[PDB]
Design a protein around this motif. Structure first.
Motif, PDB file in Angstrom:
ATOM      1  N   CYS A 193       0.838  -1.223   0.000  1.00  0.00           N
ATOM      2  CA  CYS A 193       0.000   0.000   0.000  1.00  0.00           C
ATOM      3  C   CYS A 193       0.873   1.274   0.000  1.00  0.00           C
ATOM      4  O   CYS A 193       1.848   1.385   0.768  1.00  0.00           O
ATOM      5  N   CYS A 236      -6.976   3.107   3.935  1.00  0.00           N
ATOM      6  CA  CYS A 236      -5.810   4.006   3.930  1.00  0.00           C
ATOM      7  C   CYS A 236      -6.038   5.222   3.040  1.00  0.00           C
ATOM      8  O   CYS A 236      -5.387   6.242   3.248  1.00  0.00           O
ATOM      9  N   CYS A 275      -3.284   0.694  -2.860  1.00  0.00           N
ATOM     10  CA  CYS A 275      -3.663   1.421  -1.682  1.00  0.00           C
ATOM     11  C   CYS A 275      -4.860   0.756  -1.039  1.00  0.00           C
ATOM     12  O   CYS A 275      -5.851   0.450  -1.719  1.00  0.00           O
ATOM     13  N   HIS A 276      -4.815   0.555   0.270  1.00  0.00           N
ATOM     14  CA  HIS A 276      -5.990  -0.032   0.949  1.00  0.00           C
ATOM     15  C   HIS A 276      -7.189   0.901   0.980  1.00  0.00           C
ATOM     16  O   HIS A 276      -7.035   2.103   1.100  1.00  0.00           O
ATOM     17  N   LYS A 283     -11.987   7.618   3.200  1.00  0.00           N
ATOM     18  CA  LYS A 283     -11.883   6.174   3.143  1.00  0.00           C
ATOM     19  C   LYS A 283     -12.895   5.645   2.126  1.00  0.00           C
ATOM     20  O   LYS A 283     -13.993   6.216   1.972  1.00  0.00           O
ATOM     21  N   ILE A 305       0.333   4.092   1.174  1.00  0.00           N
ATOM     22  CA  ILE A 305       0.225   4.869   2.426  1.00  0.00           C
ATOM     23  C   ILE A 305       0.826   4.136   3.637  1.00  0.00           C
ATOM     24  O   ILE A 305       1.716   4.687   4.320  1.00  0.00           O
ATOM     25  N   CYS A 306       0.397   2.917   3.935  1.00  0.00           N
ATOM     26  CA  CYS A 306       0.897   2.233   5.150  1.00  0.00           C
ATOM     27  C   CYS A 306       2.119   1.345   4.859  1.00  0.00           C
ATOM     28  O   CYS A 306       2.799   0.867   5.796  1.00  0.00           O
TER      29      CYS A 306
END
Ligand code: ZN
Ligand code: ZN
Length: 57
Positions: free
Chosen positions: A8, A34, A30-31, A38, A10-11
């Motif tokens: 992902c 995340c 990307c989740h 959202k 972002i994380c």
């Protein structure tokens, strides 16, 4: 050889694969949870990420 694992943006984790959205445009991930805002619907088909949509416009 090449090994490709998607993480992902972002994380930077590759867990929760059903929720890790992979962009058909740029192949980045990307989740749902995340993203901000959202994403609360799992896409039924292909995904195009917001960066790719902004550029296509
Ligand atoms: Zn994430
Ligand atoms: Zn993209």
């Amino acid at each position: 050889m090449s090994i490709m694992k998607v993480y992902c943006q972002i994380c930077r984790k590759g867990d929760n694969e059903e929720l890790l959205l992979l962009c058909d445009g740029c192949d980045k991930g990307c989740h749902t949870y995340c993203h901000r805002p959202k994403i609360t619907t799992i896409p039924d088909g292909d995904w195009f990420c917001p960066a790719c949509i902004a550029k296509a416009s």
